[PDB]
Amino acid sequence: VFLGFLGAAGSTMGAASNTLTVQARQLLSGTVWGIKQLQTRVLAIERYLEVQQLLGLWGCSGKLICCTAVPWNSSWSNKSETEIWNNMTWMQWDREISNYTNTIYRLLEESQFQQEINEVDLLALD
Amino acid sequence: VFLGFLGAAGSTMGAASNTLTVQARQLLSGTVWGIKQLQTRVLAIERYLEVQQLLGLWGCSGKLICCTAVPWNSSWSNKSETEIWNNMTWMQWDREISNYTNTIYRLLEESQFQQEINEVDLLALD
Amino acid sequence: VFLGFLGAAGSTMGAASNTLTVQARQLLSGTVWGIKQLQTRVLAIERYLEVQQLLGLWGCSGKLICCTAVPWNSSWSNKSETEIWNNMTWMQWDREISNYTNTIYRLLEESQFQQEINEVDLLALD
Amino acid sequence: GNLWVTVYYGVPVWREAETTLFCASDAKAYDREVHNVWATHACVPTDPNPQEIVLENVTENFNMWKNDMVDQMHEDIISLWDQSLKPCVKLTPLCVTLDCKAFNSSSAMQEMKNCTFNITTSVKGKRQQEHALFYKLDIVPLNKNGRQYRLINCNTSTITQACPKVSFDPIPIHYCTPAGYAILKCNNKTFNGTGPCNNVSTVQCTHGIKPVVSTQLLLNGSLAEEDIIIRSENLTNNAKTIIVHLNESVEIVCVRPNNMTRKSIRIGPGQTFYALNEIIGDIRQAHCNISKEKWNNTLHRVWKKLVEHFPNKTTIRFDRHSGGDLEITTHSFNCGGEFFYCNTSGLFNITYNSNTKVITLPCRIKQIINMWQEVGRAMYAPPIAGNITCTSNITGLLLTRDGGNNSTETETFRPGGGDMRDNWRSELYKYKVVEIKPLGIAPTGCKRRV
Amino acid sequence: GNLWVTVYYGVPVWREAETTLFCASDAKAYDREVHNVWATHACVPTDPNPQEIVLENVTENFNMWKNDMVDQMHEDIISLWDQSLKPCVKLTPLCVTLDCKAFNSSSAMQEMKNCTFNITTSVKGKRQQEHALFYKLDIVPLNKNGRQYRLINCNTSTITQACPKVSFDPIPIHYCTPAGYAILKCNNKTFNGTGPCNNVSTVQCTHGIKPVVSTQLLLNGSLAEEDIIIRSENLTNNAKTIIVHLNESVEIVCVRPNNMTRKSIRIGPGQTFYALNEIIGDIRQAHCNISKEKWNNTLHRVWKKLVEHFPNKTTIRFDRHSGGDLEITTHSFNCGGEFFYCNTSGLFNITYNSNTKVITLPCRIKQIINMWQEVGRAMYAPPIAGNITCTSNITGLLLTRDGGNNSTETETFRPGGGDMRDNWRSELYKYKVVEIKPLGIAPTGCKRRV
Amino acid sequence: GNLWVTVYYGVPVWREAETTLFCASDAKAYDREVHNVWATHACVPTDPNPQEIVLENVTENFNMWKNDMVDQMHEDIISLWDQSLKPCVKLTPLCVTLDCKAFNSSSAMQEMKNCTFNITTSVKGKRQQEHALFYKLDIVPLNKNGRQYRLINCNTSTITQACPKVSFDPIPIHYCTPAGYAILKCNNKTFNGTGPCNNVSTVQCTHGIKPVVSTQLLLNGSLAEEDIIIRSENLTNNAKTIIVHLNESVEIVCVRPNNMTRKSIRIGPGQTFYALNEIIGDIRQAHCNISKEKWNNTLHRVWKKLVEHFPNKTTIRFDRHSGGDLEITTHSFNCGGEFFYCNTSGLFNITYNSNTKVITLPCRIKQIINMWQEVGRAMYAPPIAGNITCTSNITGLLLTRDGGNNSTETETFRPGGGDMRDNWRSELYKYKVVEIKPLGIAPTGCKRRV
Ligand SMILES: *[C@@H]1O[C@H](CO)[C@@H](O[C@@H]2O[C@H](CO)[C@@H](O[C@@H]3O[C@H](CO[C@H]4O[C@H](CO)[C@@H](O)[C@H](O)[C@@H]4O)[C@@H](O)[C@H](O[C@H]4O[C@H](CO)[C@@H](O)[C@H](O)[C@@H]4O[C@H]4O[C@H](CO)[C@@H](O)[C@H](O)[C@@H]4O)[C@@H]3O)[C@H](O)[C@H]2NC(C)=O)[C@H](O)[C@H]1NC(C)=O
Ligand SMILES: *[C@@H]1O[C@H](CO)[C@@H](O[C@@H]2O[C@H](CO)[C@@H](O[C@@H]3O[C@H](CO[C@H]4O[C@H](CO)[C@@H](O)[C@H](O)[C@@H]4O)[C@@H](O)[C@H](O[C@H]4O[C@H](CO)[C@@H](O)[C@H](O)[C@@H]4O[C@H]4O[C@H](CO)[C@@H](O)[C@H](O)[C@@H]4O)[C@@H]3O)[C@H](O)[C@H]2NC(C)=O)[C@H](O)[C@H]1NC(C)=O
Ligand SMILES: *[C@@H]1O[C@H](CO)[C@@H](O[C@@H]2O[C@H](CO)[C@@H](O[C@@H]3O[C@H](CO[C@H]4O[C@H](CO)[C@@H](O)[C@H](O)[C@@H]4O)[C@@H](O)[C@H](O[C@H]4O[C@H](CO)[C@@H](O)[C@H](O)[C@@H]4O[C@H]4O[C@H](CO)[C@@H](O)[C@H](O)[C@@H]4O)[C@@H]3O)[C@H](O)[C@H]2NC(C)=O)[C@H](O)[C@H]1NC(C)=O
Ligand SMILES: *[C@@H]1O[C@H](CO)[C@@H](O[C@@H]2O[C@H](CO)[C@@H](O)[C@H](O)[C@H]2NC(C)=O)[C@H](O)[C@H]1NC(C)=O
Ligand SMILES: *[C@@H]1O[C@H](CO)[C@@H](O[C@@H]2O[C@H](CO)[C@@H](O)[C@H](O)[C@H]2NC(C)=O)[C@H](O)[C@H]1NC(C)=O
Ligand SMILES: *[C@@H]1O[C@H](CO)[C@@H](O[C@@H]2O[C@H](CO)[C@@H](O)[C@H](O)[C@H]2NC(C)=O)[C@H](O)[C@H]1NC(C)=O
Ligand SMILES: *[C@@H]1O[C@H](CO)[C@@H](O)[C@H](O)[C@H]1NC(C)=O
């Protein structure tokens, strides 16, 4: 069955991992009044551009979800996989990991840069 | 010999598969009058952004042309490959497959999502 | 130690190959006055879009730096690798290769298109 | 055993944020009828078959008091009034001494004045004396003998006359978010305006909202589905307004019965001013009519609901407004382009112990208007020939509690208002604006390659 | 054997669409000469060496009648006229009674009037009587004795005088698409305006188009390369206009021969109005000159072309316009800033059976202008001292057929116009706007990996 | 052995380019005080803790003479003046003949005039005679007997009075680049304005710059850190201005000592004009005060610095300005909303061979202002009641050399100016605008796969 915009928000995150595309297509969809419509369209497009660049800087551009090589830290969360992916919603999960979004992000850029320059060094001798 | 903008439109599609780059570079090239130039530039950039996202959602971002895993349906067209790629223009081909653009598109998003989540599940046990 | 915006400009290019990300995040960061802020934001975003498309057309979209298959020509520079990567700054290097930016660029688009259509032809018989 | 960071794009997760939205009018508003005050060419056609998506197992904390897109609504409606105000005629030469006499009204005493004054002719160096009909409220005496008069706003600002083609009919307006934003709607029919809402939905655009300008009463608004709803930011704080939402409307019929005549006077080149000529027939006061039993049942219902949020053995008194300007003390609203100011003492003239007749009330007419309580920006209302009848629905009430000394076992309420923002708050209570944060992080057993 | 979907980006495929474009003027228009009506700071410099790319083996169906960027051209030229109209002087005080007397013109009877009137001086409380020269057309009598007069637009609107630095010279304008759009040009020299075009090209910008304002004739336009072209949306429908395109121009020389004088009068603070003083020398009517043999050969050519699209044994009559306002009935155009209205009865005074002399025609001058058939928006034309000569090229004709009862073996044509959109349609016939849809799908034997 | 092209994104490489930037005011400027001429709602709050990044081992060639964002600064400040000028009152009726008499000033001769004139009353058909106080400079005689007078700009344009709430206080303004651009700052304390700079930094926004309007002197500007700096595009070219930057400021105290009174006169509906009433107390000339020893040491320092860039055995003469308009010949500046024009002959009255007293100078007051040397755009300055004192810092000088015939062993310098762009050039000397070109190419031994 088709699920609409934000329809899996109350669902468990394991079921909600099947409906990313609707949010993806919604994210760009569309004198003085002309100025405000124009500015808010500009705001939406540069927000999408910033999000896409943040995806690209982690080596995950053009993919809906993407795996990396950062090991997960138990200090962020010691929860088991099953409770996260069969009982845990996305809202309160974001509330939980809101303290460590920045640390996880910086570890992501650093791991991507290190792996990619390791690939460059490996192919340099090839 | 260099071919200009839309120069291979009347050509067969097999020869026209060599001049995608000119259209690619043309696709973004550039009080009240200022408002109209501004809005039409915004229109061009968000059209390009929507096209690039539609390319990214099929696992074909950053590539000029890209292959997928959707099998071709004979209900769309029972034509042979040779007549398509040595006698058939792009204009009337788009006219032919205009009925099934949406079905082919949805099969594309669905195949990309299924293959990519299969890759995620395969690497999950790794 | 963290290095700020353009902090490795005076550095050698080998050390400066570690701080591309700061410029990457800086490249989009942000009635009549409203018109000028709006237009200059539009100018910044379409400049970034043109740069990203030029990266995509070389088969290097979504990566910080990327290798290609164009062989290096000694007519552009006969300098050794060690002097370039341990004594040579980016500024005067750009001044040196400013004569051949366009030739190197066109060789890049041509090599990307040829390799990618060779991949298409190779997978055509598969 | 080991786990890895996994990046998720398109996650259904939102956060509270404040942002601007855009307007959307119906397509039938574009079928001519562009001569309306709220007729906006920027308001895009409403999206046919809008999508409302129910978010099951979702609980969100709505709060309509510090809600955004309410000050934005006020700024938008003020800007629309001003933009309609600009291309019309400004009455600079009408600040001239008037000789006003009382109206005999033979076959409303002192309410009608016959005022004669000098107007500039087609030649700027010539003046001609001409008469007009004026009200007592929109004119003020220059002196104490009651002979020389002047306009009320003459030493304040310059009035701008409404263009006669423009119509003051409210039209529905849909508010739509840009990309990356969403509007959440609380489907709970017993929602009191603040706190958690069990049944949540999302919409791209809100329902059509008519910007009705009124005080002490709400006209042509939405209705509660189940019960009478009392909304207050702090019920124990008497300084905060109280919004009462009814589950059934009350029919109100407001009529100006007199037969008017419109006279077009050439003031300057391309400047035509519309004045009131002699009244055809008898002269009678305007009035509004309310069914007695329906209003009595309404007051009993709202009294029973107000019993719950207070001590039970406390008598409740209804009283008229204490005093102030005529805009707040009386029910001021629009009716066919003519602005009515109706005395509301009768509807708030009852006290309740802890244990086909029609109420008819007087109304007055003002032509010099200072709306949104603005000073220095004034509006002249052109008259409308003939008689005027408006039938509308009472769907909400605005009440204010007075400060009782200790616990005297009595609480009195008087009709209030003044803040038109509250007029948009009774229709935007169920809607909130959220920002999408589609990036997400999750630990998974998947590991990327090298 | 099996096939797979393959996604193609950058495909040369277009579709019919309607969109807005932008203007581009030449760089030499920016070398001073900003004092022009169509001088636009937003029009970017024209791209040097524009690229026209021939699309071989391409057939497209052009149609210039329901074509877009024609109403857009009309809106742009109207907005440019209004924007040039705003910063100049509005003649509110000139609506004053004039004592006008006939001109003796001793060593054009009743065409020249000496009108004396009171003008406000440097002091607003003082008036001074002053005279001016006026035409018969731009003044109207107040009464039947022919003594008191008034301006024609006095009871309609207020005129705005053109600023004297601004010049009414048409300049070429290039229309350019934004990104993702294209303009297709039909290179077929015998194209009749609608249907397929075998030879197609694409351009980023159109050729420079001078916005020439004229009726019954087309001035300084493009020329057909091979033969006379008849363009009509429906030839059998007499209610639709007919555009005739010549392969060779006709020289037209229009001269105002009188010697004028310009008098600057201080109306108000910073307000200067330019009036016509006494005429130096003799007074003679303005006229335009056409070679008799060239026009006769032109009429024979267009008659022979019009024979084809009708029954062959049908005589064709040319007649002047039936009647209406002076703007449509006569050739109205611009010549050195002065607006000419030239009688065109001579050029349409010949019938043709089925089997160094110069034609000279009269012209009149109007100073109160209502262009684009607008009501309430009027223009005053300042005079130009001395004499005026304009030599231009006749490159097109606008004709209208009358309804003949059954088949009387005769069809008559009269010069028409009125719609300036047609004036842009004879220059935008070969250009159309298309939208790129670069995404494409193709079956191929290539399969992606896992 | 073989090498391959490698594409690099985000390279720290810039190029010289010209682009527009945006303004940013401090957050404390938004805490009320919106009634200021440079108070701009578009100027975003200044970024807290701005980042200045030192670029070690970087040499860049600055040049502030053909620098951009200086004409842009002039256009921005002109547009801000005009935008503040629009919503205020235009004095059209004040162009009326004045009967002006001399002031006895009993218990500044001919500087004060008592002028009586007719003003329009509340009725447009009535006039009343009223008096005002005016200066000698802002009035001109109509005739040679010295009885009838008129405003200076009466036959030029119409003045617009500054709104009294608006304050002429300069405020700091930060200039910030958009994305993809950068501002480079030269940290070299001995930088002379052009050439290489060894110590370079980058900033997102410049430091706060007060747009001080002055000539012959620079007020409240930045100071050199080490030594007196002489800046010239071409020192041998006498036609180019010379900017002198001091390492220590000079205290200047400018006082209008008289006690004024402001009278509000109703000119038209909603139009109030503020005039000068009778002076309370004695009448004395305004003056500015400079310490004698500090100025003498300053002149000796700048003479010693000017010795270096010229032949050593050359005497140097300081002289006052040769002549011209009062705006350039005297020090014109703002002081408490009143515009001062101060004679500067004393400070340039010394020659130097090759081997607690206070200087006090006169000042005059003008109310009709033509700033940026504009013609047709004029400003009326409302008076300020009471006395006015402004204490400021002298931080720069503007000098001009005269053409000496051959080598006469003497060079004379006079105070100049006139170009307010130079006023922004002494504060924007260290800042330049560069464009990022993040794409880069490098040969590396890395090869991509197939
Ligand atoms: C709460 O909601 C109720 C229910 O809608 C509403 O009551 C109704 O209000 C409307 C709007 O004011 C009233 O309609 C007006 O009525 C008269 C004449 O119309 C009558 O006759 C026709 C023909 O039978 C009927 O269709 C109609 O229902 C009425 O019986 C006029 O004042 C108005 O017509 C003008 O405005 C229209 C705008 O849509 C135009 O289409 C129309 O051509 C008229 O415009 C002309 O006149 C204007 C005035 O000079 C001028 O500005 C224009 O340029 C043009 O010349 C309008 O149709 C209706 O009668 C009310 N119904 C009842 C039962 O009383 C309440 O008003 C509302 N309450 C609040 C507070 O908003
Ligand atoms: C179809 O196309 C033809 C061919 O171009 C065209 O005929 C020509 O029209 C132009 C434009 O109206 C005419 O040129 C004008 O002529 C006079 C004086 O110029 C004559 O003398 C000079 C010196 O020898 C020659 O170069 C020139 O060719 C003429 O012989 C003036 O009316 C005009 O000059 C003003 O406008 C210029 C704009 O470019 C300015 O550069 C110039 O300084 C003048 O401006 C001054 O006066 C204006 C009026 O007061 C004022 O507004 C300005 O601020 C400023 O003070 C202009 O040069 C030319 O003579 C025509 N040629 C012939 C053979 O008749 C048709 O008009 C055209 N048809 C249609 C319908 O558009
Ligand atoms: C170089 O820099 C120096 C140092 O800052 C500067 O000298 C000072 O200039 C300022 C600005 O002109 C002067 O301040 C003005 O002073 C008086 C009264 O203020 C005095 O008293 C208070 C109370 O003790 C003190 O805080 C203050 O320092 C002064 O001693 C007034 O003219 C001004 O006040 C008005 O403007 C303020 C704007 O911020 C408002 O906040 C204030 O409410 C006043 O506004 C009211 O009046 C205005 C005039 O009618 C009207 O427009 C408003 O709407 C409102 O009604 C202001 O505070 C200060 O005295 C100077 N200092 C000295 C020692 O002389 C130089 O001017 C500067 N040089 C140049 C060339 O720019
Ligand atoms: C209001 O006053 C005006 C006077 O200004 C009255 O108009 C006059 O009516 C009489 C009687 O028909 C005429 O003879 C006059 O010529 C009218 N004067 C003007 C200026 O029109 C008017 O009748 C009064 N209104 C009423 C209802 O009595
Ligand atoms: C048009 O009429 C005016 C009168 O308003 C004539 O101007 C007068 O000319 C005579 C003869 O030179 C002078 O004595 C008067 O002083 C003029 N009056 C003004 C007001 O200027 C003018 O001559 C007439 N035009 C012609 C061609 O006869
Ligand atoms: C400037 O001139 C005016 C006259 O216009 C003087 O004002 C008069 O002052 C006298 C003496 O008090 C009064 O009797 C008059 O009524 C005043 N006239 C007006 C129009 O106000 C004024 O005093 C003069 N100023 C000075 C300083 O002498
Ligand atoms: C018009 O007459 C004046 C008289 O001063 C003369 O200078 C001028 O040349 C004449 N103009 C023409 C076009 O004959």
In this structure, are residues A88 and A12 in contact, taking their beta carbons and an 8 Å threshold? yes
Which of D5, D19, D55 lies closest to A7 in CB terms? D55
Domain extents for chain B? 13-124
In this structure, are residues F441 and C104 in contact, taking their beta carbons and an 8 Å threshold? yes
Q: Specify the DSSP class assigned to residue F347.
A: G
User: Residue-wise over F274-313: b if at least 16 C-beta within 10 A, else e?
Assistant: bbbeebeeebeebbbebbeebbeebbebbbeebeeeeeee
Terminal C-alpha separation, chain A: 51
- Best probe residue, ligand 3, of F334, F342, F363, F392 (max atoms within 8 Å of C-beta): F392
- Cβ contact, residue pair A67, D202, below 8 Å: no
- Helix then strand count (H, E) for chain E reads 4, 33
Method used to solve the structure: cryo-EM
Q: Which tokens hold the place of D348?
A: 């708030």
CA D353 to chain centre: 33
Please name the residues between 181 and 220 in chain F that touch chain C, using a CB distance below 8 Å.
Answer: 182, 202
| Closest atom, ligand 3, to C-alpha of F391 | 65
- Cβ contact, residue pair B34, C35, below 8 Å: yes
CA F64 to chain centre: 17
Phi and psi at residue E215, in whole multiples of 5°?
Answer: -135, 150
Q: How close does chain B come to A83, measured CA to CA in Å?
A: 17
- Cβ contact, residue pair D446, A67, below 8 Å: yes
Phi and psi at residue E396, in whole multiples of 5°?
Answer: -160, 160
Among candidate residues F125, F123, F103, F105, the one with its CA nearest the CA of residue F113: F103
- Reported in sequence order, the residue ranges of D69-147 that DSSP labels E, i.e. its strands, are 98-102, 112-120, 127-135, 139-141
Burial (CB count within 10 angstroms: exposed 0-12, middle 13-18, buried 19+), residue D387: middle
How far is the C-alpha of D128 from the C-alpha of E234, rounded, in Å? Answer: 59
**Amino acid making up residue D273:** F
Among candidate residues C67, C63, C66, the one with its CA nearest the CA of residue C21: C63
CATH of domain D4-87+166-440: 2.170.40.20
Distances (CA, A) of E409 to B89, E412, E415, F372: 49, 10, 21, 76
Q: Quick check: helix, strand or coil at residue D15?
A: strand
The residue written with tokens 């034997």 in the block is: E445
In this structure, are residues B55 and B109 in contact, taking their beta carbons and an 8 Å threshold? no
Q: Which tokens hold the place of F337?
A: 């909303």
In this structure, are residues F381 and F369 in contact, taking their beta carbons and an 8 Å threshold? yes
Q: How close does chain B come to D268, measured CA to CA in Å?
A: 31
**Amino acid making up residue D34:** V
Please report which ligand is nearest the Cα atom of F129. 6
The torsion of the CA quartet E217, E221, E226, E232, rounded to 10 degrees, works out to -50
How far is the C-alpha of B84 from the C-alpha of B76, rounded, in Å? Answer: 13
How far is the C-alpha of F327 from the C-alpha of F342, rounded, in Å? Answer: 10
CA D389 to chain centre: 19
- Reported in sequence order, the residue ranges of E261-314 that DSSP labels E, i.e. its strands, are 262-268, 271-276, 286-291
- Is there an interface between B and F (3+ Cβ pairs < 8 A)? no
Say which residues have a Cβ less than 8 Å from residue D10's Cβ, sequence separation at least 6: A20, A21, A22, A23, A24, A27, A64, D438
In this structure, are residues A2 and D199 in contact, taking their beta carbons and an 8 Å threshold? no
Q: Quick check: helix, strand or coil at residue D196?
A: strand
Among candidate residues E419, E423, E401, the one with its CA nearest the CA of residue E410: E401
In this structure, are residues F118 and F99 in contact, taking their beta carbons and an 8 Å threshold? no
In this structure, are residues F241 and F422 in contact, taking their beta carbons and an 8 Å threshold? yes
Which of E123, E125, E269 lies closest to F92 in CB terms? E269
Please name the residues between 8 and 67 in chain A that touch chain C, using a CB distance below 8 Å.
Answer: 31-32, 35, 38-39, 42, 45-46, 49-50, 53, 56-57, 59, 61-62
Phi and psi at residue F181, in whole multiples of 5°?
Answer: -130, 165
Phi and psi at residue E237, in whole multiples of 5°?
Answer: -85, 110
Chain D residues in contact with F269 (beta carbon < 8 A)? 92, 95, 154, 158
Please give the distance, rounded to the nearest whole angstrom, from the Cα atom of residue F390 to the centre of ligand 3: 9
Which of B39, B61, B117 lies closest to A62 in CB terms? B61
Among candidate residues F133, F125, F90, F78, the one with its CA nearest the CA of residue F374: F78
- Cβ contact, residue pair E51, B4, below 8 Å: yes
Q: In what order do the strands lie in the sheet with E368-369?
A: E160-161, E379-380, E368-369
How far is the C-alpha of C59 from the C-alpha of C112, rounded, in Å? Answer: 6
How do strand F350-352 and strand F331-335 relate by DSSP bridges?
Answer: unpaired
How far is the C-alpha of D214 from the C-alpha of D427, rounded, in Å? Answer: 13
Q: What is the largest CA-CA distance in chain C?
A: 60
Q: Judge if the beta carbon of residue D212 lies within 6 A of ligand 1.
A: yes
- Best probe residue, ligand 2, of E171, E331, E390 (max atoms within 8 Å of C-beta): E390
CA E209 to chain centre: 11
C-beta neighbour count of D87 within 10 angstroms: 9
- Helix then strand count (H, E) for chain A reads 6, 1
How far is the C-alpha of F151 from the C-alpha of F137, rounded, in Å? Answer: 10
CATH of E212-269+278-421 given 2.170.40.20, 3.40.50.11030, 3.40.50.300, 3.30.930.10: 2.170.40.20
Q: Whose CA is nearest to atom 9 of ligand 2?
A: E390
Distances (CA, A) of F203 to F18, F184, F197, F199, F432: 17, 6, 16, 14, 10
In this structure, are residues A60 and A66 in contact, taking their beta carbons and an 8 Å threshold? yes
- The DSSP result for F298-314, as a single string, is HHHHHHHHHHHTS-TT-
The resolution, in angstroms to one decimal, equals: 3.9
In this structure, are residues D215 and D356 in contact, taking their beta carbons and an 8 Å threshold? no
Phi and psi at residue D336, in whole multiples of 5°?
Answer: 65, 30
Phi and psi at residue B14, in whole multiples of 5°?
Answer: -65, -40
In this structure, are residues E168 and E39 in contact, taking their beta carbons and an 8 Å threshold? no
Q: Judge if the beta carbon of residue E278 lies within 6 A of ligand 5.
A: yes
Q: In what order do the strands lie in the sheet with D174-176?
A: D44-45, D22-25, D174-176
Sign of CA dihedral F5, F8, F14, F16: positive
Please give the distance, rounded to the nearest whole angstrom, from the Cα atom of residue E30 to the centre of ligand 6: 58
Domain extents for chain D? 4-87+166-440
Helix (H) or strand (E) holding F356: none
How far is the C-alpha of F333 from the C-alpha of F217, rounded, in Å? Answer: 9
How far is the C-alpha of F403 from the C-alpha of E18, rounded, in Å? Answer: 66
Q: Which tokens hold the place of D417?
A: 């208002």
Say which residues have a Cβ less than 8 Å from residue F295's Cβ, sequence separation at least 6: F250, F347, F359
Q: What is the largest CA-CA distance in chain B?
A: 60
Q: Which tokens hold the place of E437?
A: 């849809």
How far is the C-alpha of F206 from the C-alpha of F47, rounded, in Å? Answer: 11
Q: Whose CA is nearest to atom 44 of ligand 3?
A: F167
Q: Quick check: helix, strand or coil at residue D358?
A: strand
Q: Which tokens hold the place of F15?
A: 């190029």
Distances (CA, A) of E258 to E101, E279, E284, E287, E380: 20, 7, 6, 11, 20
How far is the C-alpha of C73 from the C-alpha of F3, rounded, in Å? Answer: 8
What is the domain class of F211-427 according to CATH?
mainly beta
CATH of domain E1-89+160-209+428-450: 2.170.40.20
The residue written with tokens 């309310």 in the block is: D290
Reported as half-sphere exposure (CB side, CA atoms, 13 A), residue F100 has a value of 24
Distances (CA, A) of F267 to F155, F270, F278, F380: 20, 8, 20, 15
Residues in chain E: 450
Q: Whose CA is nearest to atom 5 of ligand 6?
A: F131
In this structure, are residues E382 and E274 in contact, taking their beta carbons and an 8 Å threshold? yes
Q: How close does chain E come to D123, measured CA to CA in Å?
A: 7
Chain C contact present for A110, CB below 8 A:
no
Among candidate residues A85, E426, F98, F415, the one with its CA nearest the CA of residue D8: A85
Which of A39, A45, A61 lies closest to C62 in CB terms? A61
Among candidate residues C90, B21, C25, C56, the one with its CA nearest the CA of residue F441: C90
Among candidate residues F111, F134, F132, F130, the one with its CA nearest the CA of residue F119: F130
The residue written with tokens 């700027």 in the block is: D124
Those chains having 3 or more beta-carbon pairs within 8 angstroms of chain E are: B, C, D, F
In this structure, are residues F437 and F25 in contact, taking their beta carbons and an 8 Å threshold? no
How far is the C-alpha of F9 from the C-alpha of C63, rounded, in Å? Answer: 8
Q: Return the bridge partners of D412, or none.
A: D317
Helix (H) or strand (E) holding F83: helix F71-85
Distances (CA, A) of A54 to A51, B58, C65: 5, 20, 16
Q: Which tokens hold the place of C113?
A: 């298109």
How far is the C-alpha of A45 from the C-alpha of A47, rounded, in Å? Answer: 5
Distances (CA, A) of E185 to E54, E227, E428, F148: 9, 19, 9, 71
- The DSSP result for D368-404, as a single string, is EE-GGG-SS--EEPPP-SEEEEEEEEEEEEEEEE---
How far is the C-alpha of F277 from the C-alpha of F385, rounded, in Å? Answer: 10
- Residue spans of alpha helices (H) in D180-335: 292-308, 326-329
How far is the C-alpha of E188 from the C-alpha of E59, rounded, in Å? Answer: 11
Burial (CB count within 10 angstroms: exposed 0-12, middle 13-18, buried 19+), residue E192: middle
Q: Whose CA is nearest to atom 8 of ligand 2?
A: E390
Burial (CB count within 10 angstroms: exposed 0-12, middle 13-18, buried 19+), residue F142: middle
